[PDB]
Every structure is written in structure tokens, then in C-alpha cells.
Amino acid sequence: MGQVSAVSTVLINAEPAAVLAAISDYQTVRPKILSSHYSGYQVLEGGQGAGTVATWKLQATKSRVRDVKATVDVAGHTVIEKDANSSLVSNWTVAPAGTGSSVNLKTTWTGAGGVKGFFEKTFAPLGLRRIQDEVLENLKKHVEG
């Protein structure tokens, strides 16, 4: 059994420890770095570190909206978001990168079929990867200035 996922790494002009905290902040950071594909963001528990629970809608296209209920698991410099509603997990791994830092964002894919059917029928992985990349950009700009 293999594994497929949307992976993108973005360089950030900021301390990786600060970025880690920013990621674990689901109150003042998370909802300020969301793309236009996000809506109805609501923190259900915590909002600052492990144990945080938050929910939102992710609209890939007109008639593709994912109801996400992410459980946050912060450990070291990796923040894991496990959707309780569907089989989607997003990994937020941040690490030093020269004078700044970088974040490796890995969002897993799912579905009854393979990537072909995942794209054609359900939520386009090409769009999802773009969405996550755009959020990483927002994060970079957010923590930078």
C-alpha cells in the first residue's frame, strides 16, 4: 500500500520557533491566513497549542465543500490537523532554513478510487495543493510583517 498527498514547502523570513507558535495559534493567526476557499471558521476548543479543535468549510469549487473538523496535535515542531469528519490529515512541519525557516505542508488524500477519481469526481488535488500553498504564503507574510 502506497500513499498520496499534497506536499508543498515554503520559505519564511522568520524564526521557525515563532512560525511554529504561529501555526499552533488558531485564534489570531490561523483565521488571518486563510484563502478565499475557507468559510465558517470556528474554534471549538483551545486555540493555542495541542488539544485545539476547530472547524470550517473548504470549498474547492461550486459544488465541492468539505466540512472539516480538525483536531490539533502539536508535538516538537510539527502540528497535525486530523479531520474528524473525513479522512484528511494536514501536517505542519516547520524547521530552520539558513537565516529564516521553512514549512513542509503535507495534506493527505482519500476516496474510494485513486487520484484520477479523486480529481475527476471529488476534490481536485491540484486545487487542494494550490489552496494549501496559498495559506503558506499568507502565513509567511503574516509572521514576517
Handedness of CA 55, 59, 62, 65 (dihedral sign): negative
Residue 86, by phi and psi: left (phi above 0), alpha (psi -120 to 50) or beta?
A: beta
- Please give the radius of gyration of the chain, using alpha carbons only, rounded to the nearest integer: 15
CA distance 55 to 45: 10
| Three cell numbers written together for 50 | 495541542
| 3 state SS of 69 | strand
